[PDB]
Amino acid sequence: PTAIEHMEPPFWWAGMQHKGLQLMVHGRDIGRMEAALDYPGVRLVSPTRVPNANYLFVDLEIGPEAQPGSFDIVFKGDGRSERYRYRLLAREQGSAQRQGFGPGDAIYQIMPDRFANGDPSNDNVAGMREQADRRHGGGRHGGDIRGTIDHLDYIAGLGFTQLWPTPLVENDAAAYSYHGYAATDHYRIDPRYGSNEDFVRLSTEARKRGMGLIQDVVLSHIGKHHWWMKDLPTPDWINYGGKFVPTQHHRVAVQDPYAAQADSENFTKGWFVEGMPDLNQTNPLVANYLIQNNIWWIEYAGLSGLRIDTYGYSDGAFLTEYTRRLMAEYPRLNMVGQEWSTRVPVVARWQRGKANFDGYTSHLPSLMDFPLVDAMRNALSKTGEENGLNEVYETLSLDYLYPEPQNLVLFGGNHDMARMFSAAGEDFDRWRMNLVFLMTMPRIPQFYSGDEILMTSTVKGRDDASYRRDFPGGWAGDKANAFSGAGLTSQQRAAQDLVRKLANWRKNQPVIHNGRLMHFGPEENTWVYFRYNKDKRIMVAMNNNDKPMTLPTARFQEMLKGAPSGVDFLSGKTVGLGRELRLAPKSVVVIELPGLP
Amino acid sequence: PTAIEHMEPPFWWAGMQHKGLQLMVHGRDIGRMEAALDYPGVRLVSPTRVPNANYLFVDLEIGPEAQPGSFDIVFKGDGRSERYRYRLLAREQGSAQRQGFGPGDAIYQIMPDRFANGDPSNDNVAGMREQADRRHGGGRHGGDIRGTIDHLDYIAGLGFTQLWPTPLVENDAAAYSYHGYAATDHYRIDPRYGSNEDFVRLSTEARKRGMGLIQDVVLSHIGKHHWWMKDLPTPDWINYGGKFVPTQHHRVAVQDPYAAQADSENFTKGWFVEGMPDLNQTNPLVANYLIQNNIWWIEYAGLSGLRIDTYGYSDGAFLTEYTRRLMAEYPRLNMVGQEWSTRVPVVARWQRGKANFDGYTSHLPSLMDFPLVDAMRNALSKTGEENGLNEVYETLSLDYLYPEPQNLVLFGGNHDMARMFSAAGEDFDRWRMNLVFLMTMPRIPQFYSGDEILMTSTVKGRDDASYRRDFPGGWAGDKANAFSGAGLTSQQRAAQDLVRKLANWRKNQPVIHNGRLMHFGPEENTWVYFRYNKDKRIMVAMNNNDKPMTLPTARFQEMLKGAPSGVDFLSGKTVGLGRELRLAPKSVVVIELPGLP
Ligand SMILES: OC[C@H]1O[C@@H]2O[C@H]3[C@H](O)[C@@H](O)[C@@H](O[C@H]4[C@H](O)[C@@H](O)[C@@H](O[C@H]5[C@H](O)[C@@H](O)[C@@H](O[C@H]6[C@H](O)[C@@H](O)[C@@H](O[C@H]7[C@H](O)[C@@H](O)[C@@H](O[C@H]8[C@H](O)[C@@H](O)[C@@H](O[C@H]9[C@H](O)[C@@H](O)[C@@H](O[C@H]1[C@H](O)[C@H]2O)O[C@@H]9CO)O[C@@H]8CO)O[C@@H]7CO)O[C@@H]6CO)O[C@@H]5CO)O[C@@H]4CO)O[C@@H]3CO
Ligand SMILES: OC[C@H]1O[C@@H]2O[C@H]3[C@H](O)[C@@H](O)[C@@H](O[C@H]4[C@H](O)[C@@H](O)[C@@H](O[C@H]5[C@H](O)[C@@H](O)[C@@H](O[C@H]6[C@H](O)[C@@H](O)[C@@H](O[C@H]7[C@H](O)[C@@H](O)[C@@H](O[C@H]8[C@H](O)[C@@H](O)[C@@H](O[C@H]9[C@H](O)[C@@H](O)[C@@H](O[C@H]1[C@H](O)[C@H]2O)O[C@@H]9CO)O[C@@H]8CO)O[C@@H]7CO)O[C@@H]6CO)O[C@@H]5CO)O[C@@H]4CO)O[C@@H]3CO
Ligand SMILES: [Ca+2]
Ligand SMILES: [Ca+2]
Ligand SMILES: [Ca+2]
Ligand SMILES: [Ca+2]
């Protein structure tokens, strides 16, 4: 091997919250060397060696007096000497104070390979392990950053204010590289998507259109083709000494009074799959590496926040420190952890401010609301149940378990589950109820690309490829183009219109962002709730039955306070409320009313 | 009425914790009288007069200097004078400190009408509204206290240490009087069961056999034929002015940050059914009445605790005071609330010691563990699921939500749900798993009469009559008789023998009463857990599959610590533990090992 092959992070910033910076330097016999530097405000701590002669960790303390600039780090040993020009950048104005995504936002989720192919020429890149195959469900289809940039106006036009793409970091695998969840280089965009600079441009172009950029970060694991695997930095870098030992996924084991250490360790150290080596985050070098890398992306790419994969599969103590570090840099940031459980207590455990039985503490601002999504999908699909919506109501009543339920991400769907329209049984009227719910709950809504034109999938079991079909219009030659509206059916277009109507309306509804919620127990699969404050009331009523239903309004008087009627935002019709609310079969109304004193 | 028709409570005790005693006096124009008395230590408080001429509430303060004895309360008015000789009983030594049922106990549950007809002559009682009909599923079959007493040896012989009969208080209804849940006289045993004195004798006879007696109390409602209903003590004694307004059962509404007052009021004030007038517990006279009545039963009948029906259907503030009052009198008592929800947070809300988001405080020691019973019934029934036992494991992991999870009552079944054997799909092997689970969990186990001989029922929905078939041997002429063994199949006898073996064994296993629990995440519907302390380990392993399973024992070494083998208590077979645990199809083993160092 040659010179310095990797320097990570490759540059940094003056004026960060945490003064320490740990450089991970890789190259043949770099560990046999001694580093030296001279720059006011930067102090070189002095080596703690690792047995591997091919890695050197350099500990810097960057004082508040250190100014933007650059300086040489010089490595000397065995009659030779190596050099790296290290840059400390100036931070953009307002960087530390950046506002993360919140209740007023709506997030549009894409898989960058499956959204838009702006440049067919990067579909394959010389030297990489996988060839593109649009006809393979698990293959690379060729979506890229150029295609995403091309369609930012579309996403903004739909009413979305944040973009969350699944990971774009290099995944140089021989197969299943497209999904991004097995990083082979945490400091590089996969060249098939574009360059590091292209990703920065994506952020800047999104910001021009009023949209934030949320990065999808994996912390627990990497891909087996990561360059580390060819020469392990330390013998304990990867859990189980770099050998495949599978997790059995006992997620409660990390938060269970009756847990076996075997099960907790298996959850946090066990390999997700054979092709995903598990990072030993109990090694402080690994912890520092991940914390610094994610900060580096936030700072470099001007992100509004993060979505954190496989949340509890990382070491718990590491997550405590990681969340503390990120949030100390960016106190107004949001980060949404993916803790995939339908049990509210299991999700709620991880949110900042939670008083946990075991004293577990976290600075994680948000989690994905799998419990509530599961409840609504059940309600809308099990149409033979007398009162399926009761599950939604009862799940929501558990919100007190969360320190900040209003900061949780509620979603129509995502790349891991059945398509929203399919989960609703291809029932457009019931799908409308799901959409209304998503846009009116005291949550941060997230929507999955393609759902706005009722893309379908298999509903039973798990079928990842079926959830990730190419967006129509993302590829040259497509017969239908959802970006332009060309070739959409009337129902598809009606869906897209409704999404655009509701999401744009929602942006302008402070009562949804921070108003109160009062809901009523569902009765025979009818459900009424209100968002309210002194300025506005929004009354949602849904009739989840294939028959008309009539609801006496006396029941709702603490919210209605004698309102004789209101205008339904959906239909534009005036709806009577004096003595009863008459719902047509499978209907939902969104009645807008004056404030509640 | 004839002078004083009802005096309630009819007598009291010297030396109670709460000095106050409120007498509810009933009779024609008694409300027009004025009470007077002269007895050392007893003070008459100045009157508070309700507009109903047929009732008088008399407030006494019984100071600690009041001795046991009697004194006349004289009621003077309109030139007439009525007397009542009031008695203060001496309390039994150790009364206040009585030990309530706890984790070392096992509760046997009966319905008195359905267990044993010791006296056919009381099946009908002249004057009563219902005639017995043994062939009618919802009729009175004639079981009584004499029959229960006749068979205490049998219950004690099975290994049970507490008897819980469903209510024996008067239910003088035209139809469905048998079940006891619609009281028509809170101070009287239904004469078809026997007298008040017979109930005291049931308690004393049970005690002679090492068994406590747990009374089933209804607080929220009475029956429509209660004598109150003919002449309402106050206009607000019954919720909704004594007229039927149904509850819609929105149980979470009393513990939901988004609750409507309409829903929460409807839950606690709404009538359970038309035949069950709802008590207005916000009226302090109603509150005092119930508190005193239940204390009266505890003191009079020498009870070891209570089972409290329809728990959250009572007023929340009333419940705080009721539980406070009862626990003040009897600090070591146990009372188990029936809060029928399969959601851990909903049940846990009510247990003494819980820190609730809304500051709600309760003194209730115990609740019925519907969530865990539901989880195990799901695991045993969902035979098409690869790992249904995962529900049990995850539910258990939520025990940190309860202040005192070991004090919760775990049950094989009860009078409101499908028969335990039917719940296991009539699979003897799965039934054994449920039984072992019940007898080894950190819980107070409760068992439903008839389950020890594998009685069956319908499985779906609610079918009360199906769960409540006459105990075989309870009636003269029965051709299957569980008391003698006559007519039982080999399998039914084996069930009975196993109940006896495990219950009696449990009695002598402190490690089950107060030991730790460590469980392991179930894998492919195999599950291993341990009860352990310095003295003993008890390993439970179950294979919920119709194929053999081989579990490497490395996994369990934090509990096994190299144990080469053990003896299965159940089969009495030796079980290898050195390298692998071989489980036969549908097996459960229970292995005793010495305590860990
Ligand atoms: O970065 C890795 C991935 O992380 C992220 O998502 C993961 C979550 O963090 C993690 O918790 C977990 O979620 C599970 C959740 O916790 C569970 O409660 C449960 O929820 C329900 C589930 O959704 C239902 O489908 C069902 O589960 C059963 C299912 O019906 C049944 O078919 C079977 O599933 C087995 C598959 O059939 C089998 O093929 C294989 O799965 C493969 C998969 O086919 C393959 O494509 C590959 O997956 C890739 C994936 O495409 C990538 O995107 C990347 O995934 C990341 C996610 O995108 C993140 O968001 O990497 C993956 C790994 O390479 O590999 C899979 C693994 O072999 O095995 C399956 C079983 O082992 O059985 C299941 C039950 O076991 O019912 C559940 C109701 O309780 O399941 C959640 C997952 O669906 O997993 C997330 C990754 O999916
Ligand atoms: O003291 C009263 C009883 O209290 C104790 O148990 C009750 C629990 O505290 C309470 O939480 C709830 O528990 C669960 C319930 O058992 C489950 O069924 C289920 O309930 C939901 C159900 O799944 C839904 O379908 C719906 O139920 C409605 C139902 O669909 C609808 O038809 C109607 O119900 C009527 C019946 O269908 C009809 O037959 C008749 O009922 C008769 C009954 O057949 C007869 O035996 C007699 O019932 C007695 C009972 O036998 C007594 O033992 C006593 O019950 C107490 C329990 O034993 C306690 O342990 O009193 C009963 C009389 O009230 O008389 C009945 C009335 O004539 O009429 C029914 C009523 O119209 O309406 C229901 C309700 O809307 O919603 C259910 C709630 O969401 O899950 C519940 C908890 O989640 O009820 C327990 C009693 O079953
Ligand atoms: Ca491309
Ligand atoms: Ca891990
Ligand atoms: Ca009888
Ligand atoms: Ca009530």
XYZ file of C-alpha atoms in Angstrom, chain B residues 211-581:
371
model
C -57.206 -20.961 53.250
C -58.121 -17.311 53.153
C -61.419 -16.035 51.782
C -61.453 -13.277 49.152
C -64.710 -11.434 48.573
C -65.872 -10.222 45.152
C -67.073 -6.635 45.466
C -68.960 -4.474 43.018
C -68.568 -0.750 43.613
C -69.814 0.854 40.405
C -73.313 -0.625 40.146
C -76.258 -2.399 41.696
C -79.167 -4.414 40.247
C -82.348 -2.689 39.075
C -84.331 -4.622 41.747
C -82.328 -3.134 44.624
C -84.803 -1.733 47.182
C -83.146 1.693 46.797
C -84.616 1.882 43.319
C -88.186 2.037 44.668
C -87.390 5.167 46.728
C -84.076 6.804 45.796
C -82.223 7.866 48.986
C -81.245 11.105 47.230
C -82.144 12.451 43.757
C -78.459 11.994 42.723
C -77.821 8.615 44.462
C -77.844 6.991 41.003
C -76.033 8.548 38.080
C -78.177 10.309 35.440
C -81.026 10.891 37.928
C -81.707 7.153 38.298
C -82.510 6.747 34.604
C -80.660 4.476 32.221
C -77.891 6.207 30.237
C -75.495 3.545 28.920
C -71.733 3.571 29.082
C -69.894 3.118 25.765
C -66.893 1.684 27.679
C -64.135 4.134 26.730
C -61.884 2.887 29.441
C -58.797 4.786 28.421
C -60.758 8.119 28.746
C -60.000 8.304 32.471
C -56.234 8.076 31.780
C -55.673 9.823 28.432
C -54.049 13.249 27.879
C -56.394 13.784 24.921
C -59.522 12.682 26.766
C -62.876 14.364 26.383
C -64.739 14.881 29.655
C -67.759 13.449 27.816
C -65.922 10.140 27.487
C -64.430 10.014 30.973
C -67.802 10.907 32.586
C -69.481 8.365 30.350
C -67.053 5.687 31.556
C -67.506 6.305 35.298
C -71.186 7.420 35.308
C -72.641 5.480 32.378
C -74.694 2.436 33.206
C -72.933 -0.861 32.489
C -76.236 -2.283 31.197
C -79.856 -1.204 31.680
C -80.222 -3.759 34.508
C -77.287 -2.228 36.407
C -78.028 1.241 37.865
C -74.778 3.172 38.266
C -73.818 4.457 41.747
C -72.949 8.160 41.936
C -69.745 7.883 43.977
C -69.249 11.662 43.848
C -72.001 11.833 46.458
C -70.088 11.477 49.740
C -73.009 9.463 51.210
C -72.627 6.867 48.409
C -68.835 6.904 48.865
C -69.184 6.422 52.636
C -71.763 3.699 52.118
C -69.527 1.497 49.936
C -66.356 2.036 51.962
C -68.131 1.143 55.195
C -69.952 -1.825 53.642
C -66.746 -3.401 52.342
C -64.943 -2.773 55.599
C -67.957 -4.348 57.370
C -67.603 -7.509 55.272
C -63.824 -7.713 55.880
C -64.186 -7.300 59.661
C -67.350 -9.422 60.001
C -66.373 -12.298 57.729
C -62.644 -12.353 58.491
C -61.662 -11.865 54.846
C -58.089 -12.085 53.535
C -58.689 -9.506 50.792
C -61.026 -8.394 47.976
C -61.439 -8.806 44.253
C -62.910 -5.558 42.925
C -65.171 -5.782 39.914
C -65.323 -3.381 36.959
C -62.512 -1.390 38.496
C -62.243 1.829 36.451
C -66.038 2.124 36.035
C -65.981 3.720 39.511
C -65.217 7.414 40.023
C -61.413 7.897 40.060
C -61.379 10.227 43.066
C -63.735 7.863 44.926
C -61.342 5.016 44.148
C -58.371 6.921 45.694
C -60.321 7.424 48.916
C -61.833 3.913 48.953
C -58.442 2.264 48.528
C -56.929 4.695 51.065
C -59.663 3.927 53.647
C -59.417 0.155 53.216
C -55.620 0.017 53.306
C -55.616 2.301 56.384
C -57.803 -0.216 58.244
C -55.827 -3.216 56.977
C -52.258 -2.230 55.993
C -51.304 -5.814 54.941
C -54.497 -6.502 52.977
C -54.442 -7.307 49.304
C -57.150 -6.147 46.923
C -57.134 -7.082 43.238
C -58.860 -4.754 40.752
C -60.398 -6.109 37.562
C -59.251 -3.665 34.910
C -59.981 -5.548 31.768
C -57.387 -4.317 29.242
C -54.666 -6.235 27.472
C -52.527 -3.028 27.444
C -49.928 -3.039 30.214
C -49.999 0.794 30.645
C -53.804 0.790 31.158
C -53.676 -1.817 33.929
C -50.465 -0.433 35.576
C -52.063 3.027 35.977
C -54.080 1.755 38.924
C -51.473 -0.035 41.091
C -50.368 1.531 44.408
C -47.026 3.322 43.937
C -47.499 4.258 40.307
C -46.263 7.687 39.271
C -48.954 8.786 36.785
C -48.563 11.571 34.217
C -51.694 13.292 35.609
C -50.706 12.810 39.259
C -53.440 10.196 39.866
C -52.773 8.291 43.130
C -54.152 4.878 44.071
C -53.751 2.572 47.055
C -54.805 -0.559 45.149
C -52.227 -3.308 45.795
C -53.024 -5.612 42.869
C -54.686 -5.962 39.444
C -55.669 -8.871 37.221
C -52.938 -9.492 34.658
C -55.075 -9.537 31.487
C -52.079 -8.502 29.300
C -49.965 -11.524 30.276
C -52.870 -14.009 30.146
C -53.747 -12.645 26.703
C -50.099 -13.030 25.585
C -49.862 -16.674 26.709
C -53.307 -17.537 25.233
C -52.130 -15.991 21.939
C -48.892 -18.008 22.021
C -50.711 -21.265 22.676
C -53.447 -20.672 20.059
C -51.482 -19.006 17.207
C -50.018 -22.404 16.188
C -49.299 -21.130 12.647
C -46.920 -18.481 14.055
C -43.199 -19.357 14.160
C -42.589 -17.690 17.540
C -45.870 -16.809 19.319
C -44.180 -17.152 22.736
C -42.374 -13.894 21.847
C -45.570 -12.074 22.948
C -45.233 -13.521 26.464
C -41.551 -12.556 26.721
C -42.143 -9.010 25.459
C -45.191 -8.499 27.718
C -43.168 -9.663 30.733
C -40.394 -7.231 29.768
C -42.907 -4.446 30.452
C -43.061 -5.341 34.181
C -41.069 -2.196 35.043
C -44.352 -0.324 34.328
C -45.861 -1.816 37.501
C -44.689 -0.640 40.917
C -45.175 -4.206 42.265
C -45.527 -6.708 39.374
C -45.062 -9.708 41.720
C -48.325 -8.696 43.437
C -50.418 -8.916 40.250
C -52.795 -11.806 39.851
C -51.972 -14.091 36.949
C -54.765 -16.507 36.088
C -55.403 -19.677 34.131
C -58.840 -18.319 33.294
C -62.027 -17.121 34.940
C -65.827 -16.971 34.575
C -65.681 -14.345 31.768
C -63.385 -16.084 29.250
C -62.992 -19.319 27.346
C -62.042 -22.340 29.379
C -58.280 -22.663 29.899
C -58.248 -26.079 28.172
C -60.270 -24.738 25.212
C -57.870 -21.762 25.058
C -55.028 -24.286 24.603
C -56.919 -25.853 21.637
C -57.619 -28.902 23.880
C -53.944 -29.767 23.520
C -52.912 -31.353 26.832
C -49.238 -30.546 26.162
C -49.892 -26.841 25.559
C -52.218 -26.804 28.566
C -49.299 -28.122 30.704
C -47.200 -25.212 29.447
C -49.891 -22.740 30.555
C -50.150 -24.470 33.959
C -46.361 -24.477 34.529
C -46.259 -20.806 33.467
C -49.034 -19.902 35.892
C -47.310 -21.680 38.775
C -43.782 -20.334 38.168
C -44.227 -16.683 37.131
C -43.451 -13.816 39.610
C -47.167 -13.374 40.207
C -49.982 -14.451 42.495
C -51.553 -17.404 40.596
C -55.344 -17.761 40.378
C -57.060 -20.843 38.998
C -60.659 -21.237 37.831
C -62.727 -24.104 39.262
C -63.241 -26.852 36.653
C -59.990 -26.165 34.858
C -58.299 -28.880 36.927
C -60.411 -31.459 35.031
C -60.062 -29.807 31.645
C -63.609 -28.501 31.368
C -64.282 -27.004 27.946
C -66.231 -24.154 26.432
C -66.750 -22.204 23.250
C -63.636 -20.299 22.144
C -64.764 -17.145 20.384
C -66.341 -13.906 21.521
C -68.297 -13.749 24.764
C -70.388 -16.730 25.818
C -70.837 -16.461 29.587
C -72.974 -19.573 30.044
C -70.323 -21.746 28.329
C -67.655 -20.816 30.909
C -69.865 -21.603 33.872
C -70.974 -25.233 33.592
C -71.764 -27.065 36.825
C -68.782 -28.526 38.593
C -68.925 -32.349 38.068
C -69.742 -33.855 41.471
C -71.438 -30.687 42.799
C -74.947 -32.162 42.450
C -76.494 -35.356 43.757
C -76.724 -37.870 40.905
C -73.730 -36.606 38.897
C -72.109 -39.421 36.838
C -68.782 -37.589 36.482
C -67.535 -36.450 39.878
C -64.219 -34.591 40.186
C -64.322 -34.771 44.005
C -64.234 -38.592 44.077
C -62.675 -39.173 40.641
C -65.598 -41.212 39.342
C -66.209 -40.812 35.595
C -63.116 -38.745 34.839
C -61.155 -39.723 31.742
C -57.488 -40.684 32.234
C -56.510 -37.298 30.772
C -58.860 -35.357 33.040
C -57.559 -37.212 36.069
C -53.969 -36.564 34.914
C -54.757 -32.825 34.671
C -56.170 -32.884 38.173
C -53.186 -34.795 39.523
C -50.809 -32.288 37.851
C -52.662 -29.299 39.348
C -52.375 -30.934 42.786
C -48.659 -31.760 42.227
C -47.657 -28.274 41.019
C -49.830 -26.220 43.406
C -48.604 -28.129 46.475
C -45.029 -27.927 45.219
C -45.361 -24.163 44.630
C -46.475 -23.676 48.259
C -42.988 -24.819 49.322
C -40.937 -22.831 46.770
C -39.940 -19.418 48.192
C -37.871 -18.854 45.015
C -41.153 -18.658 43.048
C -42.771 -16.334 45.654
C -39.914 -13.809 45.827
C -37.017 -14.981 43.684
C -35.651 -13.149 40.676
C -36.694 -13.916 37.108
C -34.346 -14.088 34.163
C -35.925 -15.050 30.879
C -34.433 -15.568 27.437
C -35.923 -14.288 24.160
C -37.990 -17.162 22.675
C -36.573 -18.607 19.465
C -38.755 -20.597 17.088
C -41.387 -21.035 19.804
C -38.955 -22.442 22.361
C -38.642 -20.534 25.622
C -36.315 -20.807 28.613
C -36.509 -18.902 31.863
C -35.252 -19.194 35.439
C -36.508 -18.257 38.876
C -33.452 -17.849 41.078
C -32.027 -16.690 44.404
C -29.067 -17.692 46.611
C -30.937 -20.903 47.601
C -32.289 -22.337 44.352
C -32.657 -22.064 40.596
C -35.786 -23.311 38.889
C -35.387 -23.644 35.148
C -38.444 -23.758 32.933
C -38.036 -24.730 29.274
C -40.830 -25.191 26.791
C -40.995 -26.355 23.208
C -44.178 -25.035 21.605
C -43.683 -27.076 18.386
C -44.818 -30.498 17.180
C -41.184 -31.314 16.263
C -38.231 -31.870 18.616
C -35.916 -28.964 19.266
C -32.281 -28.928 20.299
C -31.089 -25.780 22.075
C -27.333 -25.224 22.544
C -26.841 -24.543 26.257
C -24.012 -21.997 25.824
C -26.760 -19.421 25.484
C -28.019 -19.913 29.009
C -24.697 -20.102 30.865
C -25.309 -16.973 32.969
C -28.000 -19.032 34.673
C -26.729 -22.596 34.172
C -23.068 -21.999 35.077
C -21.928 -25.402 33.797
C -24.760 -27.518 35.283
C -24.379 -30.889 33.541
C -27.968 -32.016 33.976
C -31.055 -31.778 36.165
C -34.207 -33.696 36.986
C -37.486 -32.605 35.453
C -39.961 -32.269 38.333
C -42.858 -33.021 36.001
C -41.934 -36.281 34.281
C -39.266 -37.080 36.878
C -36.882 -37.748 33.950
C -33.227 -36.613 33.907
C -32.536 -33.797 31.432
C -29.050 -33.267 29.926
C -27.736 -29.680 30.105
C -24.024 -29.915 29.285
C -23.850 -28.884 25.608
C -27.431 -29.017 24.343
C -30.952 -29.141 25.700
